[PDB]
Design a protein around this ligand. Structure first.
Ligand code: GLA
Ligand code: CA
Ligand code: MN
Length: 242
C-alpha cells in the first residue's frame, strides 16, 4: 500500500511542504488566508488565491488497476462583512493535473476557465459557493461536487454561520466510488451532508496535485474572507490486486 499523509493543526510561514499561489498568504497568527485582506482589515475584491501540497499524490495506477481511497479534513471560516453588494465567490477543495497554475478567478474559483463541461480539465472539486452565477442553483451558499466543470453534478444548500469556524470532512471510498462530504458548524450544531458517485480513474490523471483555492468577486466590495485554520489529508493506494 502506497500511502501519503499530512496534517497541519496550524500553518507556519516558510513551511516548504506548501505551495502558495496568487494572493494566498500565511499570517504570523498561523492562519491561511486564501484571498487578500486590505490594510484597513476588510476583504479585497478581485482576489484569487490557492495553496497546494508540495508533493503530487498517487491516486490510481494503470498497471495494477488500483484506485486509492482518501480523506481530507479542514477548518475554515468565511466572514461576509456586508450584505450589499452581494458577497462572492467562495472556496474549493480540488485535485487536478500536477504542476497546475491558478485558472480563472471569480465564479470559476481559480480552478476552471469557463463554465463548459470538458474532460480535458481532469479536475475534481468540492466547492463552498457563496455567489449565485448563471450556471448555479439560486440558493447560496451551497456545497457542490464539481467534476470537470464549474456546473456541479450535485449541490446542497447550507446556511452560513457568518464568521464562524466550519469543519469539513471529505471521504472517497474507491470500492464503491462514493465521494461523501460533510460540513459541521460547531457554533450552531448545523450538519450538512452530500454524496455522489465519482469514478476518479475516468476523471483524474494518475498523479494529482491536491489543494485549496478561494476567490472574491470582480465587482468592487463583492468580497469576503476565506480563512483556513487546519488541514489534513490521507490517501492509500493498494499497490497490488491479486
Ligand atoms: O459581484 C461579484 C461577481 O462579479 C461577477 O459577476 C462575477 O462573474 C461573479 O463571479 C462575482 O464575482
Ligand atoms: Ca458561483
Ligand atoms: Mn456552484
Amino acid at each position: 500500500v502506497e500511502t501519503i499523509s499530512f496534517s497541519f493543526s496550524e500553518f507556519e510561514p516558510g513551511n516548504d511542504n506548501l505551495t502558495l499561489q496568487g494572493a494566498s498568504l500565511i499570517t504570523q497568527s498561523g492562519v491561511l488566508q486564501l484571498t487578500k485582506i486590505n490594510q484597513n482589515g476588510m476583504p479585497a475584491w478581485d482576489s484569487t488565491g490557492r495553496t497546494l501540497y508540495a508533493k503530487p499524490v498517487h491516486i490510481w495506477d494503470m498497471t495494477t488497476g488500483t484506485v486509492a481511497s482518501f480523506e481530507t479534513r479542514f477548518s475554515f471560516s468565511i466572514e461576509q462583512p456586508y450584505t450589499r453588494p452581494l458577497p462572492a465567490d467562495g472556496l474549493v477543495f480540488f485535485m487536478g493535473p500536477t504542476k497546475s497554475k491558478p485558472a480563472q478567478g471569480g465564479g470559476y474559483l481559480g480552478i476552471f476557465n469557463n463554465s463548459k463541461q470538458d474532460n480535458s480539465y481532469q479536475t475534481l472539486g468540492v466547492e463552498f459557493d457563496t455567489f449565485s452565477n448563471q450556471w448555479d442553483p439560486p440558493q447560496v451558499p451551497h456545497i457542490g461536487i464539481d467534476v470537470n466543470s464549474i456546473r456541479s453534478i450535485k449541490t446542497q444548500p447550507f446556511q452560513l454561520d457568518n464568521g464562524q469556524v466550519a469543519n469539513v470532512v471529505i471521504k472517497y471510498d474507491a470500492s464503491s466510488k462514493i465521494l461523501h462530504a460533510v460540513l459541521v458548524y460547531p457554533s450552531s450544531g448545523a450538519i450538512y451532508t452530500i454524496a455522489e458517485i465519482v469514478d476518479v480513474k475516468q476523471v483524474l490523471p494518475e498523479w494529482v496535485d491536491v489543494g485549496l483555492s478561494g476567490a472574491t468577486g470582480a465587482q468592487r466590495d463583492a468580497a469576503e474572507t476565506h480563512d483556513v485554520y487546519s488541514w489534513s489529508f490521507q490517501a492509500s493506494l493498494p499497490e497490488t490486486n491479486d
